């Protein structure tokens, strides 16, 4: 979800309703966890670029003073804006930052590549995956770990040729990304290493989380797009 | 009638849902926006902030240098409203786009985030 107001939140499909189509050149999420392939897909017609973090961002947030001339430049390059964010959190007492820039026009080709991998896979196959082989990128309170590195998940399920196609599409979609060696998670008061990093997370369905999968299937557009 | 500002190169809206524990940081972030939003840096564009704090109603702000000082100008004081309602967000965007037309628009979405997860995800775990 995004945006807390009292008890009320915007679910990702509600956020898409709040945004006009084809108006914004970019959306910058100053928020945790929004560089999610599902979220970028849901919002693909709301911006040409989405600049966001796949993990948690320190509460100090983005360095708006330094970003400002870059945000208003004639030659707007959001990779520069993301670099300003990243470089801020370097040799810092909390040197923990992840960022990616997604070019939304390339998401349809990416969707097709993923569909050709996932649509014929069974849930038992997905549930069987060894989590130690995939980079976990989310440690929300009470979570057993739901969001993993997108590349690592797909790598467990693709043939060599399918994987090569996926990487070609992924590199066209994620046009800039950066990460510090570790990412800090508030619900564990620790930073953990990032061993593998593509810039986006994905849901890894788990047998123990059937209610989560049910909600995902009905409310997150990416599910029907690539699993069916 | 309200007369729109002269069209420009870019309008950026920062939509700050800070009716939560991030309150103090929204204010520090607005400070940093003020430091950066000089006439030279805004390059002719508009910086608009929808600020929804805890404890008081939302406000629409324009950040703009006038007479050598970057000002945080109150445009609108809203009544209490649900800033997480998509129709409220759309309405605010519409106010902004209408009054500050541009060749390019950007949006900063500022708040807590949890990816696609349902906001009641804790109820869907056990």
């Amino acid at each position: 979800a995004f945006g807390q107001d009292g008890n009320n939140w915007m679910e990702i499909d509600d956020l898409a309703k709040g945004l006009p189509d084809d108006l914004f050149d970019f959306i910058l999420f100053d928020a945790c966890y929004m560089a999610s392939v599902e979220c970028t897909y849901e919002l693909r017609n709301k911006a040409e670029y989405i600049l966001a973090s796949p993990t948690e961002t320190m509460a100090d947030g983005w360095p708006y003073e330094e970003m400002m001339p870059q945000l208003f430049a004639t030659d707007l390059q959001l990779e520069k804006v993301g670099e300003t964010f990243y470089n801020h959190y370097l040799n810092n007492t909390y040197p923990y930052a992840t960022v990616s820039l997604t070019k939304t026009s390339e998401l349809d080709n990416l969707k097709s590549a993923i569909h050709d991998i996932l649509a014929d896979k069974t849930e038992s196959d997905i549930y069987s995956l060894d989590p130690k082989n995939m980079q976990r990128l989310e440690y929300l309170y009470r979570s057993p770990g739901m969001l993993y590195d997108f590349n690592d998940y797909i790598k467990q399920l693709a043939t060599a040729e399918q994987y090569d196609r996926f990487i070609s599409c992924l590199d066209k979609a994620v046009v800039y990304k950066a990460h510090t060696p570790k990412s800090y998670y508030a619900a564990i008061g620790n930073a953990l290493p990032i061993k593998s990093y593509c810039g986006l997370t994905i849901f890894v369905p788990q047998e123990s989380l059937p209610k989560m999968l049910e909600w995902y299937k009905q409310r997150v557009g990416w599910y029907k797009a690539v699993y069916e | 009638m309200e007369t729109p500002e002269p069209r420009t190169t870019r309008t950026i809206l920062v939509y700050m849902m800070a009716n939560n524990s991030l309150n103090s940081f929204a204010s520090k972030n607005i400070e940093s926006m003020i430091e950066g939003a000089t006439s030279k840096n805004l390059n002719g564009g508009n910086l608009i902030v929808y600020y929804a704090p805890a404890g008081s109603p939302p406000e629409l702000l324009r950040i703009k240098e006038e007479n050598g000082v970057v000002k945080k100008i109150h445009l609108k004081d809203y009544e209490k409203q649900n800033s997480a309602d998509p129709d409220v967000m759309r309405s605010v965007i519409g106010e902004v786009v209408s009054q500050y037309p541009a060749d390019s628009y950007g949006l900063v979405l500022w708040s807590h985030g949890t990816a696609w997860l349902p906001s009641d995800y804790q109820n869907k775990l056990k």
Binding site: D30, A31, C32, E56, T57, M58, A59, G61, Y94, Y184, Y185, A186 | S21, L22, F25, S111, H112, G113
Partner: peptide, 4 residues
């Protein structure tokens, strides 16, 4: 320290 807080995160977002």
């Amino acid at each position: 320290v807080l995160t977002x």
